[PDB]
Design an enzyme around this catalytic site. Structure first.
Site, mmCIF file in Angstrom:
data_model
loop_
_atom_site.group_PDB
_atom_site.id
_atom_site.type_symbol
_atom_site.label_atom_id
_atom_site.label_comp_id
_atom_site.label_asym_id
_atom_site.label_seq_id
_atom_site.Cartn_x
_atom_site.Cartn_y
_atom_site.Cartn_z
ATOM 1 N N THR D 1 -9.917 -1.882 -5.255
ATOM 2 C CA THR D 1 -9.218 -2.503 -6.418
ATOM 3 C C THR D 1 -9.234 -1.558 -7.612
ATOM 4 O OG1 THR D 1 -9.782 -4.773 -5.744
ATOM 5 C CG2 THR D 1 -9.189 -4.431 -8.072
ATOM 6 N N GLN D 2 -8.073 -1.377 -8.233
ATOM 7 C CA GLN D 2 -7.968 -0.570 -9.442
ATOM 8 C C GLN D 2 -6.975 -1.211 -10.403
ATOM 9 O OE1 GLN D 2 -5.957 -0.242 -6.913
ATOM 10 N NE2 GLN D 2 -5.699 1.897 -6.269
#
Ligand SMILES: *[B]([O])([O])[C]([C][C]([C])[C])[N]C(=O)[C]([C]C1=[C][C]=[C][C]=[C]1)[N]C(=O)C1=[C]N=[C][C]=N1
Ligand SMILES: [Mg+2]
Ligand SMILES: [Mg+2]
Lengths: 222, 235, 211, 233, 231, 204, 195, 240, 244
Positions: D1-2
């Site tokens: 996740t970013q």
């Protein structure tokens, strides 16, 4: 935060006849309030006289169908070109879905075809792999709109014979393919009116001992 | 010394060829396939009279529609049977149906050549796999440690195999009944066995579509032995 | 969901409803909540449909393998324990399953409750699901060991009806089973709509309801 | 996740009678800052495919390298690399779609929305979309981000359904695309005046136009607008 | 002699004896023939039985709708290699929506077989394969040797007495290559080719095995009364 | 919730003239509930004494661990471990669990058998050594003990005087802590004799 | 589960454990035996999270039974209690700890003494004359503190235990459906069938 | 890891390592098993080359696997401990997962499977041990007696012997043991077991061990004096 | 490949013997003799150091007698380095048992554990076995005083009196002759030294060529004391028994 799931809308409908079966679905693909495609096929011929549609999150739907088609291919390789029966396909799909019990395929899935006695068959699946054979099943966005109508017009629920006043039910006479297709079209036309994710087009796949036939009908584009 | 997976100058795997010699030393097992069913029969060959012969289990159930007889180093067969039973029931779990006899046999034979330097040597046992399915009907397979399997109308394995196979060559025809096949296995077993054949040192079994795989009682086999003696004395 | 099962003089009764819900929407009118593991073993289903189907069908694989290895049918006690041990592997992972393993073996009739926590309980009578409280009310006041097969089948049927009426998440139809030493016997699918009106008239019950 | 950092906005495209057109502006935004003004977001693959990418630019540059390596790998032990066994638009798309869906399944997505435009061996037009979720769809017109809301409506007035494709010429299609890019410049706050446009035709091949500008803009009426209601001066 | 104990050992003349012994297993195997035109490609295989009660060992395996092979030697090794091809054909379809080129399929088989010839502990494959297929560049025929060597050919044969069929095809080269749009005549040429390798025995109904693939023809295998037409 | 104050308890140690003293309460609780009045928190490995406060399971675990390690030390070294060396062993052992620590407050006390020098040391839950000259405190009434020790203590006390000082420090600190008390023990330690005394205190 | 009590008298150890098992809002069983015989002279009662309790108890039982067969010798109650404590102290820092509290009642045949050990899920062991887990002690310890002598007979221990159960039945909000009582002495383990 | 294939086929189709493991069994002290009508007796030879032995603490030849099953052996002593340990673990594992104790047949099948596994696994040699496994199934009064060997084969026996000079005592049992009427009592069964060992043992002093197993987990080992009384009575009848 | 150079340490001979175990025993037969004698009130451990030098520091030396815990000790015969590997493992096992059960490990359980480790090296791994034979002298409250031996095969047995290393045949005959069941520690001390004095390959038995130890309940009241004898104490007991 990254949300790995999405909703591409759409609605599907499977009806089992006496010696045939239909699997219908609208061709509209959406996200939120936008249309992605007015014609994006959702019901597929998977081989061995079986049709399939995975409704919900398109990416998971395409992956499941792709895998099942692959499962049919390897069933031929491994078991001397034996025909995969509809009941065997259904059980196979349960295990495909449950392999991701803790990161599910976000799709309501329906398959249709003929059983080993030649009679019409429809199987319905939840996202985690519970399945069961049915005579009638609507899935997806407008499932709640359509199913009650099918309970009434296919299984003759709450319908009794005039004169008796509730004492004798309406007998469960079988439906022809021409009669079924009318109920399918009226189901999707009604669903299109009251559900924003349903419209554009309707594609129906009909399964008989002769094979798999297609029929397409326009729907409202608003 | 030398590799376990080594080829001979003739193009054969030494270890596979040597395991075949161990199978020749094993007790006789015979299978006959008919349109009314497949019959499986074995020589028990107890090493002593104090050994309770009914504990000798050389005929084995894999599924309701598949049976199996063995010959050679019979201890090696236990893991093969365990795999076969697992494969049969697992396929029933995945596909809600019986598994094809050929597909079951192929699954067993896939273990065969999984040896090297996986297990350390090939299996020292041959299997006669008999069964029935809807597609190909009554079937009899011979599964070797080479990984090869042939289908047979009739087949004998073990110490009296080439003598029994020659006898099966003459006797087998496509119109055999189940009763005729039973007597034929008993006849050929009695011919190749060292000791005198009776219900205690020989065992019969069959697979039919209706009743499935059944190992015969010693009382039931005893009657078939008595029926054999009388029909041989009849001419 | 309402399921029940109880032991008695002539074996064990097994009764379940057939409703499946997705929120307040009735997704299924006729869901089979019993699994035929073998001719002498039954399994009920309550909770997540996927979990119930998968793990009890996997139990059937493992109970079948037991027969092949040992040449003998598995006990109800051993079957129930295999299932509880499966639940204990996915401990805290979020499975939802409540099941009764009903059967006949060498000890006589057997009945075990098993759930997702791994709990495994032997007993004469059990009831699981959102409508179990309604079923227990009828069962506790009318149960006897000295019940006839006919009356026992009715008790289980009537107990499900009680729950189907009051519980919003129970209904559809009633599936009945009777387990004997010669195996289980299916006693049909009974629509609650029709059964309710029938019971009302014959029994005189549900006086407050108009019909 | 970013989270996406340096981003590219709308990519728009449409089919016409003999091929496909695709376009995208040359901006790399850093939040509300219009940081990089010389970013090419259309990436040709051979002479029959153009991949248009929106979203995170670092992930775009990663995809650009995968495609460059894909061409290299296809040429290996392939005497027909520039002929029958050349890379097709459908091959390139399916590869990307496989990558996008695998990355989302590992909860580490490529934060992009991609449109693969091209022409197949048999002359058929190819136009398909894929994004960070692995979601794919095809349509006579396709657009990402703001383009989906503003460009598609304009482009669907030219090609509303499949039967309108043979009736649409390259001049009409390019006119519609260029008009759409002007509208996006009026109304998208993360857009630039400078853009690139690519045409893939089954007869004339790949035409790649750089350093295009939005022109013929209407602003004069702004002089007459005074205050927010009652103000006259 | 002293240098044939394992695959990891060259002989003083630079030979790999274990590979050569694996090659020998192919020569013991039953004959199989391959040939193609510009439109179709055909496999013809003489199946072998154990005895009169036994079935005839299957020789031809399908890998995809557009590709398959015939075997000669250790059948289990053909099952392993054909399984690998099935997976590779399938990886090409699922990832790239692309049917695997026959030439690339040969390159993959070569590299898989090679790893077994250079490492300690393992052994070479004991089987030879004839791969046919129809891809974007038309019909193809490949010959696989377990040394790793793969060769694209108009026609060929492997197995016992295969030299007779190979000479016939070498004479007929100019004729059978021109058999375009006529599957039955191409099979006839294959059946006539494999007949040059027969001694004592002849082609019966459960002896012969034929396979074909082409322009508008999926890979299909013909056995039993389906090949009585060509006897 | 706080592991260091679920079970409760205290330990205090003091130096004197050619002697050391270490004392502890006997309470073990489950928060408000008193469970045991016989839970001694002082252990010894040869002539080296170790008091441990905090989570009771870790107190028990560490005692068993240091018994294990000191018994092996002795078999290999052919001599008993000394307070200075043991202190380093305690620190090493605690820091090896730096990111999953034992919730304890150990206190070492003893006299070096060779030099005759009195020695005390305290640690935090993860191994930091506090080698004090005067006194060391640990437990749920550590604030109370600091106040008592800092006022009552004076250097070079004789064994029988040191006994009174450490006892009064412990007792009055425990009587201002809800989680400490229910009995008390005091060890008086000299180079080759050790006396253990149970104190009479209020049982609430 | 809910209630488990223990009391060590002159020549025996008495364990009392509730019979109720609840799921959701319904009491599924009112005759549940929350105990396992570890060895002929050692009994362990247990209470904690659903499922974990029985699986832990049976795991301990299997280990002790294995030891008994291997050595042809019964471990002392002290040795068993230490083994159990170590397993729980090991468990508390695991990925998913076993949430089980136990009482171990045993008769040491070597010393000819009854012994009662109380161990919580953290691995906190204490030897006691009487003990309990959870809230049980809040109601009962005042009675035990008052009436308990170490020279009590088994019959006197049962009478004091009845008084503890009566107090629980009066002041506890939960219905635990009575208790099953078991006695551990020199002759082994037996159940009091009327209580 | 060490993966070397030690158990392999020879040209004549023999696995020599398995056959040499049988030679280790031949070297081992004699063990005998006899089942009566309501019991099973396990007899074991103790070689008297070792005196000054402490018989209290010396590993006994008969080992309890569970409360209802016992195991004796002939061959390498150290090897037998590994099989016994595994068997004991499996016995508790079966009780834990299936809630019934193992049947004698199941326990035998497991031990035999372990022996077999060591004949086709890399880096290991076969167990130089043959076992006699005896007992009574739960809630069953039919006696059970099984034998295993290094190859992994197993079978049930009315009476059987293994170890050194087992050929002689088997000869004795074959002519003395009647199947139609087995030893009706414990006395008759023990007497026949002692008689069979007296053909081989040498002195009937501390060289013979006897262990009687009866139904419902009733297992006891006879003492020196109890056995000595059988030895006395046998020879006094022989003097005639 | 590597197979060429593999000795195959874990195989049977045609006669059913383990080659490496038999050869390891041959090695041990050249090692200094160690004797153990069990009495009613204690156990004696006596052992002979191998051809020493005058420049060897004896008082800090240990090649034969080792302490496993407070209750159990061992006498070594064979490779000392191999023995120390096993000894440290045994010391750890005893401490593991004590930590788990809070009781000192029973003698047999420790002996079985070490013997199982030895067994493993004869059945798997392809490594050479430990060239060591132990005499275990220990006490616990179940069986009281106990003597065991283990050898490279991993087989162990219990004894009243036993010898390992060199001249065990001669030594065992002498022990079997003079040993009696009602014997005491002081008598057993004399028997052990007399046996070594007759079986030794050296010209004379002196204090500098011996290691000696006793395990006595001769500790103040119900408890057990281990005594590893010092060089001067071995010299005194040699004079007392009348050997020097
Ligand atoms: B029952 O309510 O427990 C029922 C039993 C199951 C075997 C069909 N479960 C459900 O109806 C659940 C929802 C639920 C309602 C009340 C209590 C617990 C659970 N629904 C599903 O399992 C389900 C699965 N797929 C589609 C729709 N619903
Ligand atoms: Mg609409
Ligand atoms: Mg208080």
């Amino acid at each position: 935060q990254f949300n790995p799931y999405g909703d591409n809308g759409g609605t599907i409908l499977g009806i089992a006849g006496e010696d045939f079966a239909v699997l219908a679905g609208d061709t509209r693909n959406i996200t939120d309030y936008s249309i992605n495609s007015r014609y994006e096929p959702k019901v597929f011929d998977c081989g061995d006289n079986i049709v399939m549609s995975a409704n919900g999150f398109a990416a998971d739907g395409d992956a499941l169908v792709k895998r099942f088609k692959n499962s049919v291919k390897w069933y031929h390789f491994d078991h001397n070109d034996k025909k995969l029966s509809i009941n065997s396909a259904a059980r196979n799909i349960q295990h495909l879905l449950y392999s991701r019990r803790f990161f599910p395929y976000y799709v309501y899935n329906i398959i249709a075809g003929l059983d080993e006695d030649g009679k019409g068959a429809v199987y319905s699946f939840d996202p985690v792999g519970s399945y069961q054979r049915e005579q009638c099943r609507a899935g997806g966005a407008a499932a709640s709109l359509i199913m009650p109508f099918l309970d009434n017009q296919v299984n003759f629920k709450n319908q009794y014979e005039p004169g008796t006043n509730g004492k004798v039910k309406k007998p469960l006479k079988y439906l022809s393919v021409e009669e079924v297709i009318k109920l399918v079209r009226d189901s999707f036309t009604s669903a299109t009116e009251r559900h924003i994710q349903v419209g554009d087009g309707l594609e129906i796949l009909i399964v008989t001992k002769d094979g798999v036939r297609k029929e397409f009908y326009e729907l409202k584009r608003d | 010394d030398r590799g376990v997976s080594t080829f001979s100058p003739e193009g054969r795997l030494f270890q596979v060829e040597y395991s075949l010699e161990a199978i020749k030393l094993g007790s006789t097992a015979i299978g006959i396939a008919t349109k009314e069913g497949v019959v499986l029969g074995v020589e028990k060959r107890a090493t002593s009279p104090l050994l309770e012969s009914d504990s000798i289990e050389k005929i084995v159930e894999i599924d309701r529609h598949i049976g199996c007889a063995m010959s050679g180093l019979t201890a090696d067969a236990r893991s093969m049977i365990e795999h076969a039973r697992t494969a049969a029931v697992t396929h029933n779990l995945y596909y809600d149906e019986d598994i094809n006899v050929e597909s079951l046999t192929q699954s067993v034979c896939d273990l065969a050549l999984r040896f090297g330097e996986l297990m350390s040597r090939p299996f020292g046992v041959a299997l006669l796999i008999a069964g029935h399915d809807a597609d190909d009907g009554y079937q009899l397979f011979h599964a070797e440690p080479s990984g090869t399997f042939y289908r047979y109308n009739a087949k004998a394995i073990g110490s009296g195999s080439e003598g029994a196979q020659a006898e099966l060559l003459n006797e087998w025809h496509s119109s055999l009944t189940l009763k005729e096949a039973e007597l034929l296995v008993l006849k050929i077993l009695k011919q190749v066995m060292e000791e005198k054949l009776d219900e205690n040192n020989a065992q019969l079994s069959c697979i039919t579509k209706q009743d499935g795989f059944k190992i015969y009682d010693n009382e039931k086999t005893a009657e078939l032995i008595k029926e054999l003696k009388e029909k041989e004395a009849a001419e | 969901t309402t399921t029940l099962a109880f032991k008695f003089q002539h074996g064990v009764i097994v009764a379940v409803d057939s409703r499946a819900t997705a929120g307040s929407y009735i997704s299924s009118l006729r869901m089979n909540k019993v699994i035929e593991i073998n001719p002498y073993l039954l399994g009920t289903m309550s909770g997540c449909a996927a979990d119930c189907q998968y793990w009890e069908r996997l139990l059937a694989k493992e109970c079948r393998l037991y027969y092949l290895r040992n040449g003998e049918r598995i006990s109800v006690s051993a079957a129930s324990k295999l299932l509880s041990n499966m639940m204990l592997q996915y401990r805290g992972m979020g499975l939802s399953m409540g099941s009764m393993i009903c059967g006949w073996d060498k000890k006589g009739p057997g009945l075990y409750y098993v759930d997702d926590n791994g709990t495994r309980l032997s007993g004469q009578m059990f009831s699981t699901g959102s409508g179990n409280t309604y079923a227990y009310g009828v069962l506790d006041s009318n149960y006897k060991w000295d019940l006839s097969v006919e009356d026992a089948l009715y008790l289980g049927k009537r107990s499900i009806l009680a729950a189907a009426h009051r519980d919003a998440y129970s209904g559809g139809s009633v599936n009945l089973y009777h387990v004997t030493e010669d195996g289980w016997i299916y006693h049909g699918n009974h629509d609650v709509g029709e059964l309710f009106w029938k019971v009302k008239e014959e029994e005189g019950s549900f006086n407050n309801v108009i019909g | 996740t970013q989270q996406p950092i340096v981003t590219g906005t709308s990519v728009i495209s449409m089919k016409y009678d003999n091929g496909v057109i695709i376009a995208a502006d040359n901006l790399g935004s850093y939040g509300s800052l219009l940081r990089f003004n010389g970013v090419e977001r259309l990436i040709p693959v051979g002479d029959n495919t153009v991949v248009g990418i929106s979203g995170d630019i670092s992930d775009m540059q990663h995809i650009e390298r995968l495609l460059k390596d894909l061409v290299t790998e296809n040429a290996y032990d392939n005497p027909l690399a520039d002929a029958e066994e050349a890379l097709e638009p459908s091959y390139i798309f399916e590869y990307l779609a496989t990558v996008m869906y695998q990355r989302r399944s590992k909860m580490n997505p490529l934060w992009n929305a991609i449109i693969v435009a091209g022409v197949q061996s048999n002359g058929d037009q190819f136009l398909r979309y894929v994004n960070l979720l692995g979601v794919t769809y095809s349509s006579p017109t396709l657009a990402t981000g703001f383009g989906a809301h503003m460009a598609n409506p304009l482009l669907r007035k030219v090609v509303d359904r499949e039967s309108d494709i043979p009736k649409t010429t390259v001049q009409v299609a390019e006119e519609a695309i260029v008009n759409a890019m002007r509208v996006l410049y009026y109304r998208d706050a993360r857009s630039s005046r400078n853009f690139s446009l690519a045409i893939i035709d089954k007869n004339t091949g790949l035409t790649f136009k750089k350093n295009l500008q939005v022109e013929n803009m209407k602003w004069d009426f702004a002089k007459d607008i005074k205050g927010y209601g009652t103000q006259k001066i | 002699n002293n240098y044939d104990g394992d695959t990891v050992t060259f002989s003083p003349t630079g030979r790999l004896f274990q590979v050569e012994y694996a090659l020998e297993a192919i020569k013991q195997g039953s004959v199989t023939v391959g040939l193609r035109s510009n439109t179709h490609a055909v496999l013809v295989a003489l199946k072998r039985n154990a005895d009169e009660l036994s079935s005839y060992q299957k020789k031809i395996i399908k890998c995809d709708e557009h590709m398959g092979l015939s075997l000669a030697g250790l059948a289990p090794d053909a099952r392993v290699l054909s399984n690998y091809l099935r997976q590779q054909c399938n990886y090409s379809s699922l990832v790239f929506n692309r049917k695997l080129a026959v030439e690339r399929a040969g390159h993959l088989l070569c590299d898989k077989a090679q790893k077994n010839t250079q490492s300690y502990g393992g052994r070479p494959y004991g089987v030879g394969l004839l791969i046919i297929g129809y891809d974007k560049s038309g019909a193809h025929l490949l010959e696989f040797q377990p040394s790793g060597n793969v060769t694209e050919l108009y026609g060929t044969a492997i197995g016992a007495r295969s030299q007779g069929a190979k000479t016939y095809l070498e004479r007929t080269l100019d004729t059978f290559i021109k058999i375009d749009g006529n599957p039955d005549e191409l099979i006839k040429a294959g059946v006539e080719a494999i007949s040059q390798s027969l001694r004592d025995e002849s082609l019966t109904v459960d002896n012969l095995s034929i396979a074909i693939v082409g322009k508008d023809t999926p890979f299909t295998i013909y056995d039993g009364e389906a090949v009585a037409k060509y006897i | 919730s706080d592991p260091s104050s679920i079970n409760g308890g205290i330990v205090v140690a003091m130096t004197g003239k050619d002697c050391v003293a270490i004392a502890c309460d006997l309470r073990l609780g489950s928060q408000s509930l008193g469970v045991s009045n016989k839970f001694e928190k002082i252990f010894h490995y040869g002539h080296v004494f170790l008091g441990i406060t905090g989570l009771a399971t870790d107190v028990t675990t560490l005692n068993e661990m240091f018994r294990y390690k000191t018994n092996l030390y002795k078999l290999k070294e052919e001599r008993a471990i000394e307070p200075e060396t043991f202190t380093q062993l305690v620190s090493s052992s605690l820091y090896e669990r730096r990111f999953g620590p034992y919730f304890v407050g150990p206190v070492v006390a003893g006299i070096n058998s060779k030099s005759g020098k009195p020695f005390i040391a305290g640690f935090d839950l993860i191994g930091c050594i506090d080698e004090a000259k005067d006194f060391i405190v640990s437990g749920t009434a550590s604030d109370q003990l600091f106040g008592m020790c800092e006022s009552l203590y004076e250097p070079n006390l004789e064994p029988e005087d040191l006994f009174e000082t450490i006892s009064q420090a412990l007792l009055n600190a425990a009587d201002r802590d809800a989680l400490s008390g229910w009995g008390a023990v005091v060890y008086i330690i000299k180079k080759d004799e050790v006396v253990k005394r149970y104190l009479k205190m209020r049982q609430d | 589960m809910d209630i488990i009590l223990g009391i060590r008298v002159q020549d025996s150890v008495i364990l009392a454990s509730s019979k109720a098992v609840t799921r959701g809002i319904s009491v599924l069983k009112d005759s549940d035996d929350k105990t396992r015989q570890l060895s002929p002279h050692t009994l362990m009662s247990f209470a904690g999270e659903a499922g974990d309790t029985v699986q832990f108890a049976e795991y301990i039982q299997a280990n002790i039974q294995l030891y008994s067969i291997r050595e042809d010798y019964e471990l002392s109650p002290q040795a068993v209690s230490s083994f159990v404590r170590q397993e729980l102290a090991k468990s508390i820092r695991s990925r998913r700890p076993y949430q089980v509290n136990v009482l171990i009642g045993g008769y040491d045949k070597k010393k000819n003494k009854p012994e009662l050990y109380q161990i919580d899920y953290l691995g906190t062991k204490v030897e006691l004359p009487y003990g309990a887990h959870g809230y049980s002690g809040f109601y009962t310890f005042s009675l035990l503190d008052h009436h308990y002598r170490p020279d009590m007979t088994t019959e006197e221990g049962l009478d004091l235990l009845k008084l503890c159960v009566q107090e629980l039945e009066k002041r506890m909000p939960m219905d635990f459906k009575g208790v099953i009582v078991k006695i551990v002495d020199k002759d082994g383990i037996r159940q009091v069938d009327d209580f | 890891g060490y993966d070397r294939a030690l158990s392999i086929f020879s040209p004549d189709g023999h696995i020599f390592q398995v056959e040499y493991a049988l030679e280790a069994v031949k070297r081992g002290t004699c063990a005998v098993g006899v089942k009566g009508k309501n019991c099973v007796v396990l007899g074991c030879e103790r070689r008297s080359t070792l005196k000054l032995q402490d018989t209290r603490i010396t590993p006994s030849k008969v080992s309890k696997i569970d409360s209802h099953v016992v195991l004796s052996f002939s061959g390498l002593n150290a090897d037998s401990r590994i099989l016994i340990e595994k068997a004991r673990v499996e016995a508790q594992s079966h009780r834990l997962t299936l809630e019934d104790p193992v049947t004698v047949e199941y326990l035998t099948r497991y031990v035999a499977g372990v022996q077999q596994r060591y004949t086709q696994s890399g880096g290991v040699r076969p167990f130089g041990v043959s076992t006699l496994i005896a007992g009574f199934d739960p809630r069953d009064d039919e006696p059970k007696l099984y034998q295993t060997e290094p190859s992994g084969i197993y079978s049930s026996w009315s009476a059987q012997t293994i170890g050194r000079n087992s050929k002689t005592v088997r000869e004795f049992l074959e002519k003395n043991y009647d199947r139609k009427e087995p030893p009706a009592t414990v006395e008759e069964c023990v007497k026949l077991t002692v008689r069979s060992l007296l053909e081989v043992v040498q002195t009937g002093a501390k060289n013979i061990e006897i262990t009687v197993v009866k139904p419902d987990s009733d297992i006891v080992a006879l003492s020196s004096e109890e056995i000595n009384q059988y030895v006395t009575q046998i020879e006094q009848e022989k003097q005639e | 490949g590597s197979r060429r150079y593999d000795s195959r340490t874990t195989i049977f001979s045609p006669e059913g013997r383990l080659y490496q175990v038999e050869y390891a025993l041959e090695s041990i037969s050249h090692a200094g003799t160690a004797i153990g004698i069990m009495a009613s009130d204690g156990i004696v451990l006596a052992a002979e150091r191998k051809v020493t030098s005058t420049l060897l520091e004896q008082d800090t030396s240990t090649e034969k007698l080792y302490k496993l815990n407070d209750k159990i000790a061992v006498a070594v015969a064979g490779l000392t380095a191999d023995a120390e590997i096993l000894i440290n493992t045994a010391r750890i096992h005893a401490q593991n048992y004590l930590k788990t059960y809070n009781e000192d490990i029973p003698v047999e359980i420790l002996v079985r554990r070490l013997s199982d480790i030895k067994q493993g090296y004869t059945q798997h791994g392809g490594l050479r076995p430990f060239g060591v034979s132990f005499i275990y002298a220990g006490y616990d409250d179940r069986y009281g005083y106990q003597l065991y031996t283990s050898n490279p095969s991993g087989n162990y047995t219990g004894w009243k009196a036993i010898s390992v290393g060199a001249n065990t045949s001669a030594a065992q005959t002498l022990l079997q002759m003079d040993y009696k069941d009602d014997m005491k520690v002081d008598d057993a001390i004399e028997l052990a030294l007399k046996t070594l004095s007759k079986t030794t390959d050296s010209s004379a038995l002196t204090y500098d060529r011996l290691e000696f130890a006793t395990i006595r309940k001769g500790a103040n009241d119900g408890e057990v004391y281990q005594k590893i004898f010092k060089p001067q104490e071995i010299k005194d007991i040699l004079v007392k028994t009348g050997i020097t």
